[PDB]
Amino acid sequence: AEVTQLSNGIVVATEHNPSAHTASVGVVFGSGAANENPYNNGVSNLWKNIFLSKENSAVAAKEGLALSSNISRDFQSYIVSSLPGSTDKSLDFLNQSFIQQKANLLSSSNFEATKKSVLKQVQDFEDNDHPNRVLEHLHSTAFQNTPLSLPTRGTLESLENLVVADLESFANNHFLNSNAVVVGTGNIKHEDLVNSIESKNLSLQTGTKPVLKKKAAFLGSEVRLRDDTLPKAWISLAVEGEPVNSPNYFVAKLAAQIFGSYNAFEPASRLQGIKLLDNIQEYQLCDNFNHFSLSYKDSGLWGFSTATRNVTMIDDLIHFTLKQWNRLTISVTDTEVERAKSLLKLQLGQLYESGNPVNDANLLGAEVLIKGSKLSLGEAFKKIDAITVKDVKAWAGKRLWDQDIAIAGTGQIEGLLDYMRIRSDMSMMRW
Amino acid sequence: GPPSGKTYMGWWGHMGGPKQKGITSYAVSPYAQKPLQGIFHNAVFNSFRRFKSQFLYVLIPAGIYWYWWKNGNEYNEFLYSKAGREELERVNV
């Protein structure tokens, strides 16, 4: 329940939990796919893949350490998990790979075998993971010609034309000290870790700052990846959401909980206290849907994603869903808000407190990099419970009502009507 | 309902076209676009093109008919003037 963080030469952030059997240690850099270019796009993902290379991974396996990495938009992270006792040997492997082997991982035999793996990896994604593929393209069109548009896994064309020098160039511009935070989760104490860190000196590229860019911006638009050979239609639609560290950060997430997620095959899901379900179940407008409030450093996306085999009624799916969202500005009820608060706490809890320290590190790391600290789970609940119907209405009237949208879809989307028809539904006629 | 005869047009989701794959489209909200004023400087010299290719198909048949009309008219005028009463008696009945 304690979020301890101190700075000496490097910023150290930890969160202890004695009941945890293992401990995870790692470095989280304040730069991700949002820092790349259209041409070196996929370099971060490539780094992650060599860090988990058979060679580097075997060295950690002998020592009894497990490797894990995650490439996001605003950040990047390299994590090593171990037993509570080997909390020192994780730091040896961390330093040995980011300073000593910052040239042994980049061999012309390791790099090629890895490049061939991320190529089959990113290709498999585009060929089969339609829901995530669609969600990735949603960011692509919504934030076109802006940092948030670049996909995390990179594109096949920028990937196959990438070389060892590109990795180095990126590493020497972002893997800096002022653009880093060392994180530790599990059971180890803050004072326990900071000592092993403040022990080993050496700055290594100190005072150096990463390159700057241009601010991210939402552009109402769409990308339609029609493919009549797929057995379904997958669509994602959203408005400009909230950036992390926004006053309405929670109002937005609550609003998404009101409509929540659905799965037509799960008996219990068909019974949720969601008004939209009365409309969509009559003719079974979809197999599933899920709302989200994605937040990043400069912006975010608020909307929903859905999958359906009812290809001749896609317009009803979109129409009923948008009519429900209209409600947030004009008629959302106290009980809908209250139901959302309870369910938001339950999901926010299950995230911030899972039985896995690697998840804790990513959540902690990502937060401290943006606001310099982490809001305690109990602090969130105070903010969540304080939200009134009046708040949700003021938010919706600014973010949802008669606002541009961004759309992306693949599969049998002939039935997804034109942009203007969808856009017109972002409001209602009144006297 | 009662069985319907097969046609060459369906409806949204089953239009009757061939299966599409590989084509990706993009568009941008009219709201985000430059309000109507840019249809000049960039869209002016480009215009008038769908009549520079067509005017001949219209003009030649028009010319042929206008000439033919003018001729017969002027001939009728001559026939009913003093100078042409001689020719009138000839071509008439």
PDB file of N, CA and C in Angstrom, chain B residues 1-86:
ATOM      1  N   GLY B   1     -42.099 -13.920 -45.179  1.00  0.00           N
ATOM      2  CA  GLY B   1     -42.837 -13.286 -46.305  1.00  0.00           C
ATOM      3  C   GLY B   1     -42.782 -14.109 -47.581  1.00  0.00           C
ATOM      4  N   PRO B   2     -43.458 -13.653 -48.656  1.00  0.00           N
ATOM      5  CA  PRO B   2     -43.511 -14.322 -49.964  1.00  0.00           C
ATOM      6  C   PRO B   2     -42.165 -14.289 -50.689  1.00  0.00           C
ATOM      7  N   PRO B   3     -41.826 -15.371 -51.411  1.00  0.00           N
ATOM      8  CA  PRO B   3     -40.562 -15.468 -52.159  1.00  0.00           C
ATOM      9  C   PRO B   3     -40.360 -14.306 -53.146  1.00  0.00           C
ATOM     10  N   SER B   4     -39.155 -13.745 -53.147  1.00  0.00           N
ATOM     11  CA  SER B   4     -38.810 -12.626 -54.024  1.00  0.00           C
ATOM     12  C   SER B   4     -37.877 -13.046 -55.170  1.00  0.00           C
ATOM     13  N   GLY B   5     -38.126 -12.506 -56.365  1.00  0.00           N
ATOM     14  CA  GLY B   5     -37.301 -12.814 -57.526  1.00  0.00           C
ATOM     15  C   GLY B   5     -35.869 -12.291 -57.422  1.00  0.00           C
ATOM     16  N   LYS B   6     -34.912 -13.060 -57.945  1.00  0.00           N
ATOM     17  CA  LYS B   6     -33.493 -12.674 -57.924  1.00  0.00           C
ATOM     18  C   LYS B   6     -33.249 -11.452 -58.807  1.00  0.00           C
ATOM     19  N   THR B   7     -32.485 -10.508 -58.276  1.00  0.00           N
ATOM     20  CA  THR B   7     -32.165  -9.270 -58.973  1.00  0.00           C
ATOM     21  C   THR B   7     -30.649  -9.086 -59.065  1.00  0.00           C
ATOM     22  N   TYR B   8     -30.223  -7.912 -59.516  1.00  0.00           N
ATOM     23  CA  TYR B   8     -28.801  -7.627 -59.629  1.00  0.00           C
ATOM     24  C   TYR B   8     -28.328  -6.615 -58.587  1.00  0.00           C
ATOM     25  N   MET B   9     -29.153  -6.393 -57.565  1.00  0.00           N
ATOM     26  CA  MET B   9     -28.826  -5.492 -56.464  1.00  0.00           C
ATOM     27  C   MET B   9     -29.425  -6.053 -55.157  1.00  0.00           C
ATOM     28  N   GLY B  10     -28.621  -6.092 -54.101  1.00  0.00           N
ATOM     29  CA  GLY B  10     -29.096  -6.569 -52.815  1.00  0.00           C
ATOM     30  C   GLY B  10     -29.270  -5.380 -51.881  1.00  0.00           C
ATOM     31  N   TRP B  11     -28.745  -5.489 -50.665  1.00  0.00           N
ATOM     32  CA  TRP B  11     -28.855  -4.401 -49.693  1.00  0.00           C
ATOM     33  C   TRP B  11     -27.594  -4.410 -48.854  1.00  0.00           C
ATOM     34  N   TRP B  12     -27.436  -3.418 -47.987  1.00  0.00           N
ATOM     35  CA  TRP B  12     -26.261  -3.314 -47.117  1.00  0.00           C
ATOM     36  C   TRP B  12     -25.893  -4.641 -46.463  1.00  0.00           C
ATOM     37  N   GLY B  13     -24.686  -5.123 -46.765  1.00  0.00           N
ATOM     38  CA  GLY B  13     -24.243  -6.390 -46.217  1.00  0.00           C
ATOM     39  C   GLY B  13     -24.323  -7.517 -47.237  1.00  0.00           C
ATOM     40  N   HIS B  14     -25.149  -7.348 -48.271  1.00  0.00           N
ATOM     41  CA  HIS B  14     -25.290  -8.349 -49.338  1.00  0.00           C
ATOM     42  C   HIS B  14     -25.670  -7.646 -50.650  1.00  0.00           C
ATOM     43  N   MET B  15     -24.861  -6.657 -51.031  1.00  0.00           N
ATOM     44  CA  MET B  15     -25.122  -5.858 -52.221  1.00  0.00           C
ATOM     45  C   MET B  15     -25.128  -6.630 -53.523  1.00  0.00           C
ATOM     46  N   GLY B  16     -24.409  -7.751 -53.551  1.00  0.00           N
ATOM     47  CA  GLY B  16     -24.354  -8.561 -54.754  1.00  0.00           C
ATOM     48  C   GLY B  16     -23.090  -8.360 -55.579  1.00  0.00           C
ATOM     49  N   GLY B  17     -22.160  -7.571 -55.053  1.00  0.00           N
ATOM     50  CA  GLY B  17     -20.908  -7.353 -55.740  1.00  0.00           C
ATOM     51  C   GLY B  17     -19.987  -8.529 -55.475  1.00  0.00           C
ATOM     52  N   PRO B  18     -18.787  -8.536 -56.072  1.00  0.00           N
ATOM     53  CA  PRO B  18     -17.842  -9.638 -55.856  1.00  0.00           C
ATOM     54  C   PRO B  18     -17.182  -9.429 -54.494  1.00  0.00           C
ATOM     55  N   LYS B  19     -16.574 -10.475 -53.941  1.00  0.00           N
ATOM     56  CA  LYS B  19     -15.902 -10.361 -52.646  1.00  0.00           C
ATOM     57  C   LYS B  19     -14.701  -9.420 -52.734  1.00  0.00           C
ATOM     58  N   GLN B  20     -14.663  -8.411 -51.878  1.00  0.00           N
ATOM     59  CA  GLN B  20     -13.573  -7.440 -51.892  1.00  0.00           C
ATOM     60  C   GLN B  20     -12.516  -7.791 -50.861  1.00  0.00           C
ATOM     61  N   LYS B  21     -11.252  -7.650 -51.244  1.00  0.00           N
ATOM     62  CA  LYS B  21     -10.121  -7.944 -50.365  1.00  0.00           C
ATOM     63  C   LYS B  21      -8.921  -7.157 -50.888  1.00  0.00           C
ATOM     64  N   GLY B  22      -8.124  -6.596 -49.984  1.00  0.00           N
ATOM     65  CA  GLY B  22      -6.956  -5.845 -50.395  1.00  0.00           C
ATOM     66  C   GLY B  22      -7.117  -4.349 -50.580  1.00  0.00           C
ATOM     67  N   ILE B  23      -8.356  -3.883 -50.699  1.00  0.00           N
ATOM     68  CA  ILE B  23      -8.623  -2.454 -50.876  1.00  0.00           C
ATOM     69  C   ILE B  23      -8.843  -1.827 -49.498  1.00  0.00           C
ATOM     70  N   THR B  24      -8.147  -0.731 -49.226  1.00  0.00           N
ATOM     71  CA  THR B  24      -8.255  -0.028 -47.957  1.00  0.00           C
ATOM     72  C   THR B  24      -8.607   1.421 -48.266  1.00  0.00           C
ATOM     73  N   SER B  25      -9.657   1.950 -47.636  1.00  0.00           N
ATOM     74  CA  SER B  25     -10.042   3.331 -47.904  1.00  0.00           C
ATOM     75  C   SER B  25      -9.810   4.228 -46.714  1.00  0.00           C
ATOM     76  N   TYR B  26      -9.632   5.511 -46.978  1.00  0.00           N
ATOM     77  CA  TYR B  26      -9.392   6.471 -45.914  1.00  0.00           C
ATOM     78  C   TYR B  26     -10.218   7.706 -46.189  1.00  0.00           C
ATOM     79  N   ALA B  27     -10.662   8.375 -45.131  1.00  0.00           N
ATOM     80  CA  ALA B  27     -11.437   9.595 -45.281  1.00  0.00           C
ATOM     81  C   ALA B  27     -11.255  10.471 -44.039  1.00  0.00           C
ATOM     82  N   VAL B  28     -11.616  11.742 -44.166  1.00  0.00           N
ATOM     83  CA  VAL B  28     -11.474  12.696 -43.085  1.00  0.00           C
ATOM     84  C   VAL B  28     -12.764  13.494 -42.922  1.00  0.00           C
ATOM     85  N   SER B  29     -13.179  13.676 -41.675  1.00  0.00           N
ATOM     86  CA  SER B  29     -14.392  14.408 -41.369  1.00  0.00           C
ATOM     87  C   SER B  29     -14.469  15.760 -42.057  1.00  0.00           C
ATOM     88  N   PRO B  30     -15.646  16.078 -42.621  1.00  0.00           N
ATOM     89  CA  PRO B  30     -15.886  17.347 -43.305  1.00  0.00           C
ATOM     90  C   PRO B  30     -15.683  18.468 -42.299  1.00  0.00           C
ATOM     91  N   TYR B  31     -15.878  18.153 -41.022  1.00  0.00           N
ATOM     92  CA  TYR B  31     -15.711  19.136 -39.955  1.00  0.00           C
ATOM     93  C   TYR B  31     -14.263  19.600 -39.831  1.00  0.00           C
ATOM     94  N   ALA B  32     -13.340  18.662 -40.027  1.00  0.00           N
ATOM     95  CA  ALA B  32     -11.909  18.921 -39.942  1.00  0.00           C
ATOM     96  C   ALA B  32     -11.327  19.524 -41.217  1.00  0.00           C
ATOM     97  N   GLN B  33     -12.148  19.658 -42.252  1.00  0.00           N
ATOM     98  CA  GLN B  33     -11.672  20.190 -43.519  1.00  0.00           C
ATOM     99  C   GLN B  33     -11.829  21.687 -43.657  1.00  0.00           C
ATOM    100  N   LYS B  34     -10.971  22.253 -44.494  1.00  0.00           N
ATOM    101  CA  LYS B  34     -10.944  23.678 -44.764  1.00  0.00           C
ATOM    102  C   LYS B  34     -12.293  24.101 -45.341  1.00  0.00           C
ATOM    103  N   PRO B  35     -13.028  24.969 -44.619  1.00  0.00           N
ATOM    104  CA  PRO B  35     -14.343  25.464 -45.045  1.00  0.00           C
ATOM    105  C   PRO B  35     -14.325  25.968 -46.482  1.00  0.00           C
ATOM    106  N   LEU B  36     -15.378  25.632 -47.217  1.00  0.00           N
ATOM    107  CA  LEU B  36     -15.531  25.983 -48.626  1.00  0.00           C
ATOM    108  C   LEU B  36     -15.064  27.377 -49.059  1.00  0.00           C
ATOM    109  N   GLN B  37     -13.863  27.405 -49.630  1.00  0.00           N
ATOM    110  CA  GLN B  37     -13.223  28.619 -50.132  1.00  0.00           C
ATOM    111  C   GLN B  37     -11.995  28.213 -50.946  1.00  0.00           C
ATOM    112  N   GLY B  38     -11.529  26.986 -50.718  1.00  0.00           N
ATOM    113  CA  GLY B  38     -10.363  26.474 -51.414  1.00  0.00           C
ATOM    114  C   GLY B  38     -10.611  26.025 -52.842  1.00  0.00           C
ATOM    115  N   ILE B  39     -11.870  26.049 -53.273  1.00  0.00           N
ATOM    116  CA  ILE B  39     -12.224  25.644 -54.632  1.00  0.00           C
ATOM    117  C   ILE B  39     -11.922  26.779 -55.615  1.00  0.00           C
ATOM    118  N   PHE B  40     -10.647  27.159 -55.638  1.00  0.00           N
ATOM    119  CA  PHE B  40     -10.093  28.208 -56.489  1.00  0.00           C
ATOM    120  C   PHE B  40      -8.584  28.167 -56.279  1.00  0.00           C
ATOM    121  N   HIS B  41      -7.827  28.617 -57.280  1.00  0.00           N
ATOM    122  CA  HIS B  41      -6.360  28.619 -57.242  1.00  0.00           C
ATOM    123  C   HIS B  41      -5.855  27.190 -57.467  1.00  0.00           C
ATOM    124  N   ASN B  42      -6.539  26.226 -56.855  1.00  0.00           N
ATOM    125  CA  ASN B  42      -6.205  24.811 -56.984  1.00  0.00           C
ATOM    126  C   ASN B  42      -7.273  24.084 -57.797  1.00  0.00           C
ATOM    127  N   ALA B  43      -8.513  24.555 -57.689  1.00  0.00           N
ATOM    128  CA  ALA B  43      -9.633  23.958 -58.410  1.00  0.00           C
ATOM    129  C   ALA B  43     -10.336  24.990 -59.290  1.00  0.00           C
ATOM    130  N   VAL B  44      -9.662  25.386 -60.366  1.00  0.00           N
ATOM    131  CA  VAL B  44     -10.196  26.361 -61.312  1.00  0.00           C
ATOM    132  C   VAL B  44      -9.687  26.061 -62.723  1.00  0.00           C
ATOM    133  N   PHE B  45      -8.368  25.948 -62.864  1.00  0.00           N
ATOM    134  CA  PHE B  45      -7.746  25.638 -64.147  1.00  0.00           C
ATOM    135  C   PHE B  45      -8.011  24.168 -64.459  1.00  0.00           C
ATOM    136  N   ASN B  46      -8.127  23.376 -63.396  1.00  0.00           N
ATOM    137  CA  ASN B  46      -8.402  21.950 -63.491  1.00  0.00           C
ATOM    138  C   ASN B  46      -9.813  21.744 -64.038  1.00  0.00           C
ATOM    139  N   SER B  47     -10.717  22.653 -63.675  1.00  0.00           N
ATOM    140  CA  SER B  47     -12.106  22.601 -64.120  1.00  0.00           C
ATOM    141  C   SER B  47     -12.204  22.928 -65.611  1.00  0.00           C
ATOM    142  N   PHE B  48     -13.426  22.924 -66.141  1.00  0.00           N
ATOM    143  CA  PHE B  48     -13.677  23.200 -67.559  1.00  0.00           C
ATOM    144  C   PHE B  48     -13.062  22.139 -68.470  1.00  0.00           C
ATOM    145  N   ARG B  49     -12.575  21.062 -67.860  1.00  0.00           N
ATOM    146  CA  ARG B  49     -11.955  19.961 -68.589  1.00  0.00           C
ATOM    147  C   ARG B  49     -12.993  18.981 -69.137  1.00  0.00           C
ATOM    148  N   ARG B  50     -14.098  18.803 -68.413  1.00  0.00           N
ATOM    149  CA  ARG B  50     -15.148  17.883 -68.849  1.00  0.00           C
ATOM    150  C   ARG B  50     -16.107  18.532 -69.856  1.00  0.00           C
ATOM    151  N   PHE B  51     -15.542  19.368 -70.725  1.00  0.00           N
ATOM    152  CA  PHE B  51     -16.294  20.052 -71.772  1.00  0.00           C
ATOM    153  C   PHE B  51     -15.340  20.417 -72.910  1.00  0.00           C
ATOM    154  N   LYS B  52     -14.044  20.262 -72.653  1.00  0.00           N
ATOM    155  CA  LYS B  52     -12.998  20.529 -73.638  1.00  0.00           C
ATOM    156  C   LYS B  52     -12.824  19.247 -74.457  1.00  0.00           C
ATOM    157  N   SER B  53     -13.280  18.141 -73.873  1.00  0.00           N
ATOM    158  CA  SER B  53     -13.224  16.824 -74.493  1.00  0.00           C
ATOM    159  C   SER B  53     -14.564  16.544 -75.153  1.00  0.00           C
ATOM    160  N   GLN B  54     -15.600  17.226 -74.672  1.00  0.00           N
ATOM    161  CA  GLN B  54     -16.956  17.027 -75.161  1.00  0.00           C
ATOM    162  C   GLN B  54     -17.530  18.040 -76.142  1.00  0.00           C
ATOM    163  N   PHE B  55     -17.074  19.288 -76.080  1.00  0.00           N
ATOM    164  CA  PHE B  55     -17.617  20.335 -76.948  1.00  0.00           C
ATOM    165  C   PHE B  55     -17.708  20.009 -78.435  1.00  0.00           C
ATOM    166  N   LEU B  56     -16.800  19.181 -78.941  1.00  0.00           N
ATOM    167  CA  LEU B  56     -16.829  18.820 -80.356  1.00  0.00           C
ATOM    168  C   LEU B  56     -18.025  17.934 -80.687  1.00  0.00           C
ATOM    169  N   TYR B  57     -18.345  16.998 -79.791  1.00  0.00           N
ATOM    170  CA  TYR B  57     -19.487  16.107 -79.980  1.00  0.00           C
ATOM    171  C   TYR B  57     -20.779  16.906 -79.978  1.00  0.00           C
ATOM    172  N   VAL B  58     -20.788  18.025 -79.257  1.00  0.00           N
ATOM    173  CA  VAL B  58     -21.958  18.891 -79.191  1.00  0.00           C
ATOM    174  C   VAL B  58     -21.935  19.941 -80.315  1.00  0.00           C
ATOM    175  N   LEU B  59     -20.811  20.653 -80.440  1.00  0.00           N
ATOM    176  CA  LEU B  59     -20.648  21.717 -81.434  1.00  0.00           C
ATOM    177  C   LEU B  59     -20.821  21.360 -82.906  1.00  0.00           C
ATOM    178  N   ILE B  60     -20.188  20.284 -83.363  1.00  0.00           N
ATOM    179  CA  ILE B  60     -20.296  19.887 -84.767  1.00  0.00           C
ATOM    180  C   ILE B  60     -21.737  19.585 -85.195  1.00  0.00           C
ATOM    181  N   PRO B  61     -22.468  18.755 -84.424  1.00  0.00           N
ATOM    182  CA  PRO B  61     -23.857  18.461 -84.793  1.00  0.00           C
ATOM    183  C   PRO B  61     -24.675  19.760 -84.682  1.00  0.00           C
ATOM    184  N   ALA B  62     -24.344  20.603 -83.701  1.00  0.00           N
ATOM    185  CA  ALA B  62     -25.034  21.886 -83.519  1.00  0.00           C
ATOM    186  C   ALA B  62     -24.788  22.773 -84.729  1.00  0.00           C
ATOM    187  N   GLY B  63     -23.516  22.892 -85.124  1.00  0.00           N
ATOM    188  CA  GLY B  63     -23.125  23.687 -86.281  1.00  0.00           C
ATOM    189  C   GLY B  63     -23.847  23.246 -87.546  1.00  0.00           C
ATOM    190  N   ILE B  64     -23.795  21.945 -87.829  1.00  0.00           N
ATOM    191  CA  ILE B  64     -24.459  21.375 -88.993  1.00  0.00           C
ATOM    192  C   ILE B  64     -25.926  21.786 -89.022  1.00  0.00           C
ATOM    193  N   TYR B  65     -26.613  21.644 -87.889  1.00  0.00           N
ATOM    194  CA  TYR B  65     -28.029  21.991 -87.809  1.00  0.00           C
ATOM    195  C   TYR B  65     -28.336  23.489 -87.844  1.00  0.00           C
ATOM    196  N   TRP B  66     -27.464  24.300 -87.257  1.00  0.00           N
ATOM    197  CA  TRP B  66     -27.703  25.734 -87.277  1.00  0.00           C
ATOM    198  C   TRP B  66     -27.523  26.264 -88.698  1.00  0.00           C
ATOM    199  N   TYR B  67     -26.485  25.785 -89.377  1.00  0.00           N
ATOM    200  CA  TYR B  67     -26.221  26.195 -90.752  1.00  0.00           C
ATOM    201  C   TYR B  67     -27.384  25.794 -91.639  1.00  0.00           C
ATOM    202  N   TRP B  68     -27.809  24.540 -91.504  1.00  0.00           N
ATOM    203  CA  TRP B  68     -28.912  24.008 -92.297  1.00  0.00           C
ATOM    204  C   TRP B  68     -30.174  24.828 -92.059  1.00  0.00           C
ATOM    205  N   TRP B  69     -30.386  25.252 -90.820  1.00  0.00           N
ATOM    206  CA  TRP B  69     -31.557  26.049 -90.494  1.00  0.00           C
ATOM    207  C   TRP B  69     -31.486  27.456 -91.101  1.00  0.00           C
ATOM    208  N   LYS B  70     -30.342  28.115 -90.925  1.00  0.00           N
ATOM    209  CA  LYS B  70     -30.121  29.464 -91.444  1.00  0.00           C
ATOM    210  C   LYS B  70     -30.299  29.523 -92.951  1.00  0.00           C
ATOM    211  N   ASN B  71     -29.777  28.514 -93.627  1.00  0.00           N
ATOM    212  CA  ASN B  71     -29.860  28.430 -95.067  1.00  0.00           C
ATOM    213  C   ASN B  71     -31.302  28.355 -95.571  1.00  0.00           C
ATOM    214  N   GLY B  72     -32.073  27.405 -95.050  1.00  0.00           N
ATOM    215  CA  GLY B  72     -33.449  27.252 -95.483  1.00  0.00           C
ATOM    216  C   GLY B  72     -34.314  28.467 -95.200  1.00  0.00           C
ATOM    217  N   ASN B  73     -33.972  29.164 -94.125  1.00  0.00           N
ATOM    218  CA  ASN B  73     -34.703  30.343 -93.715  1.00  0.00           C
ATOM    219  C   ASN B  73     -34.476  31.487 -94.690  1.00  0.00           C
ATOM    220  N   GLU B  74     -33.205  31.745 -94.986  1.00  0.00           N
ATOM    221  CA  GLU B  74     -32.802  32.798 -95.905  1.00  0.00           C
ATOM    222  C   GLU B  74     -33.321  32.536 -97.304  1.00  0.00           C
ATOM    223  N   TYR B  75     -33.476  31.265 -97.641  1.00  0.00           N
ATOM    224  CA  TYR B  75     -33.986  30.899 -98.944  1.00  0.00           C
ATOM    225  C   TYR B  75     -35.483  31.196 -99.008  1.00  0.00           C
ATOM    226  N   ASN B  76     -36.178  30.982 -97.894  1.00  0.00           N
ATOM    227  CA  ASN B  76     -37.617  31.217 -97.818  1.00  0.00           C
ATOM    228  C   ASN B  76     -37.894  32.721 -97.928  1.00  0.00           C
ATOM    229  N   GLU B  77     -37.029  33.514 -97.298  1.00  0.00           N
ATOM    230  CA  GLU B  77     -37.133  34.964 -97.301  1.00  0.00           C
ATOM    231  C   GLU B  77     -36.987  35.453 -98.746  1.00  0.00           C
ATOM    232  N   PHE B  78     -36.005  34.908 -99.455  1.00  0.00           N
ATOM    233  CA  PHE B  78     -35.792  35.271-100.849  1.00  0.00           C
ATOM    234  C   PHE B  78     -37.026  34.916-101.687  1.00  0.00           C
ATOM    235  N   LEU B  79     -37.527  33.696-101.534  1.00  0.00           N
ATOM    236  CA  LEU B  79     -38.691  33.257-102.293  1.00  0.00           C
ATOM    237  C   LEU B  79     -39.923  34.160-102.166  1.00  0.00           C
ATOM    238  N   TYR B  80     -40.101  34.781-101.004  1.00  0.00           N
ATOM    239  CA  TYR B  80     -41.264  35.632-100.779  1.00  0.00           C
ATOM    240  C   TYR B  80     -41.047  37.137-100.959  1.00  0.00           C
ATOM    241  N   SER B  81     -39.881  37.495-101.487  1.00  0.00           N
ATOM    242  CA  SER B  81     -39.553  38.885-101.785  1.00  0.00           C
ATOM    243  C   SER B  81     -39.853  39.077-103.276  1.00  0.00           C
ATOM    244  N   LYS B  82     -39.779  40.320-103.755  1.00  0.00           N
ATOM    245  CA  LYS B  82     -40.039  40.616-105.168  1.00  0.00           C
ATOM    246  C   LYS B  82     -39.077  39.860-106.069  1.00  0.00           C
ATOM    247  N   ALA B  83     -37.789  40.001-105.770  1.00  0.00           N
ATOM    248  CA  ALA B  83     -36.721  39.369-106.535  1.00  0.00           C
ATOM    249  C   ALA B  83     -36.890  37.876-106.783  1.00  0.00           C
ATOM    250  N   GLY B  84     -37.587  37.192-105.879  1.00  0.00           N
ATOM    251  CA  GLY B  84     -37.753  35.758-106.024  1.00  0.00           C
ATOM    252  C   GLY B  84     -39.101  35.200-106.426  1.00  0.00           C
ATOM    253  N   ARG B  85     -40.061  36.058-106.761  1.00  0.00           N
ATOM    254  CA  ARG B  85     -41.392  35.585-107.140  1.00  0.00           C
ATOM    255  C   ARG B  85     -41.375  34.710-108.385  1.00  0.00           C
ATOM    256  N   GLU B  86     -40.328  34.859-109.186  1.00  0.00           N
ATOM    257  CA  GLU B  86     -40.174  34.080-110.408  1.00  0.00           C
ATOM    258  C   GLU B  86     -39.802  32.653-110.007  1.00  0.00           C
TER     259      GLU B  86
END
